[PDB]
């Protein structure tokens, strides 16, 4: 009955210690979650930028149309006779 | 002696409880860590698709140019 007391003072020196660690895992978990909210947004950002690169492609797709239409009108006007 | 014994058995029954919650928070933290890794990638994905949307624009610019330089070689031939 010197160790019995010495160990109830060592026991709760440990249960303070393991609380403080549980505090920093919870605190953390929270911040973890505020990084996990960005991902829904970034997954969109991708798909916007994409759909845009597309709608830009479509523009460029169609322009080329005008461009044979021009080169072809200038194969027509070049042979004036 | 044997009254302090009653409370040093609750003290280590509390360490068991506390650890169990440690384990679960860690376990959990790792499932969320998997999703937090994709982040750095998606941030890149964005900034590839971007520089590319740009690249398409510069392809258009240079085409539409050709086309104006044609609608001046056809604007002359109007006799």
């Amino acid at each position: 009955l010197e160790d019995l007391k010495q160990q109830l003072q060592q026991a709760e020196e440990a249960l303070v210690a393991k609380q403080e660690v549980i505090d920093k895992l919870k605190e953390e978990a929270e911040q973890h979650k505020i990084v996990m909210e960005t991902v829904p947004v970034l997954k969109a950002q991708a798909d916007i930028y994409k759909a845009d690169f597309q709608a830009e492609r479509q523009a460029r797709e169609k322009l080329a149309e005008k461009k044979e239409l021009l080169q072809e009108q200038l194969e027509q006007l070049q042979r004036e006779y | 002696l044997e009254d302090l014994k009653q409370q040093l058995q609750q003290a280590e029954e509390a360490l068991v409880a506390k650890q169990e919650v440690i384990d679960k928070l860690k376990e959990e933290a790792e499932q969320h860590k998997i999703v937090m890794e994709t982040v750095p990638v998606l941030k890149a994905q964005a900034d590839i698709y971007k520089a590319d949307f740009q690249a398409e624009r510069q392809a258009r610019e240079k085409l539409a140019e050709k086309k104006e330089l044609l609608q001046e070689q056809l604007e002359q031939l109007q006799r």
């Binding site: 160790d3 160990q7 060592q10 026991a11 440990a14 393991k18 | 003290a11 280590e12 029954e13 360490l15 068991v16 650890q19 169990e20």
Partner: peptide, 27 residues
Amino acid sequence: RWACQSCTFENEAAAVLCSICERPRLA
């Protein structure tokens, strides 16, 4: 004198935690 049923180390009965794991007696 007990073996922490995490890293199985012959630990002193005096110690409430592991000398390696910081892990309790009953788990």
